[PDB]
Amino acid sequence: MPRVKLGTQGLEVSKLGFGCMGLSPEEQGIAVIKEAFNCGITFFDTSDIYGENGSNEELLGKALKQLPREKIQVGTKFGIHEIGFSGVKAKGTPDYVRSCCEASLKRLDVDYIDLFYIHRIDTTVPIEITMGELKKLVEEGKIKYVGLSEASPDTIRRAHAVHPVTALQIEYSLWTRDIEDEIVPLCRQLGIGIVPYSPIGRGLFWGKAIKEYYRIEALSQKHGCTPVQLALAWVLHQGEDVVPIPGTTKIKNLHNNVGALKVKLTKEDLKEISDAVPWKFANTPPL
Numbered sequence: 001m002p003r004v005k006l007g008t009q010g011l012e013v014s015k016l017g018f019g020c021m022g023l024s025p026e027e028q029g030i031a032v033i034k035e036a037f038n039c040g041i042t043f044f045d046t047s048d049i050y051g052e053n054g055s056n057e058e059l060l061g062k063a064l065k066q067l068p069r070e071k072i073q074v075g076t077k078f079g080i081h082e083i084g085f086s087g088v089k090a091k092g093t094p095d096y097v098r099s100c101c102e103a104s105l106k107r108l109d110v111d112y113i114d115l116f117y118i119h120r121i122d123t124t125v126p127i128e129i130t131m132g133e134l135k136k137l138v139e140e141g142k143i144k145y146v147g148l149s150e151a152s153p154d155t156i157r158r159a160h161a162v163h164p165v166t167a168l169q170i171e172y173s174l175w176t177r178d179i180e181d182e183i184v185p186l187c188r189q190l191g192i193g194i195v196p197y198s199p200i201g202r203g204l205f206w207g208k209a210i211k212e213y214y215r216i217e218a219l220s221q222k223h224g225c226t227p228v229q230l231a232l233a234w235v236l237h238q239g240e241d242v243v244p245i246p247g248t249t250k251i252k253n254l255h256n257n258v259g260a261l262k263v264k265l266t267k268e269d270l271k272e273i274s275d276a277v278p279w280k281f282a283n284t285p286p287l
């Protein structure tokens with residue numbers, strides 16, 4: 001398993017990460033995490049908001065007790081404070097940053113978090129204030145690196161000016177390439193790592209809806225992998241600074257995802273994949 005530098009501050013992760021969200025039957029969740037590590041995945045992603053009352057963080061914390069903590073990069077997050085009919089409410093006051101961090105440390109049962117993200121931006125608090133408390137947490141050793149998720153270009157730039165941002169987590173896949181026009185270039189200018197979430201799930205849902213397409217399947221066959229591996233490989237190929245965090249609850253799919261790292265695609269291969277996604281009469285439909 002290759003390792004890559006995520007951002008410029010010193011974080012180093014496995015080229016493929018693992019999203020723990022979906023896991024929240026405990027023994028079996030722990031077993032998936034342990035097998036991911038046995039496959040060389042060291043980067044594990046969660047958030048305070050996943051599971052019930054932080055049960056996903058608790059799960060990861062239990063799994064960690066069976067692993068070498070210092071070999072693993074734990075990413076978690078804070079910021080979503082309530083969810084209701086009216087929608088999601090974010091909070092980014094310094095007191096909340098600190099209390100969320102402490103609660104996550106306790107649920108994960110760790111002395112530090114590697115990568116701590118603002119999960120959702122608080123549009124009522126200047127981002128400098130939130131980042132200021134995150135800077136204090138870095139200086140105290142409570143967290144090592146700071147991430148953002150779903151942030152505007154203006155928020156990214158202003159955040160980074162206060163304390164360097166290590167990663168941006170955003171949706172990115174063959175089916176969702178909005179970040180390419182402005183976000184990707186900006187992250188590259190600032191040295192910020194890119195962490196795609198839903199690198200395969202939206203495509204899987206689509207594949208299922210359309211099933212109940214062939215160009216993608218024929219390209220996967222051509223490249224000796226499955227359609228999902230091709231999708232994940234495409235994301236993997238978008239840069240040395242791109243680390244996707246697909247989730248799964250199944251060991252077989254975990255092994256499939258790891259297998260996607262084997263796929264090698266040329267610039268031309270990549271365009272062909274992108275371009276595909278905007279007896280006498282014994283014939284078949286053309287590709």
Ligand SMILES: Nc1ncnc2c1ncn2[C@@H]1O[C@H](COP(=O)(O)OP(=O)(O)O)[C@@H](O)[C@H]1OP(=O)(O)O
Binds near residue numbers: 019202246252256
């Ligand atoms: N190799 C694979 N083949 C088929 N489905 C897979 C897969 N890897 C992950 N998934 C599914 O893809 C989903 C996860 O996709 P994702 O990580 O891109 O995130 P998201 O839920 O945000 O879409 C899960 O539904 C997962 O289901 P399983 O737990 O049954 O695996």
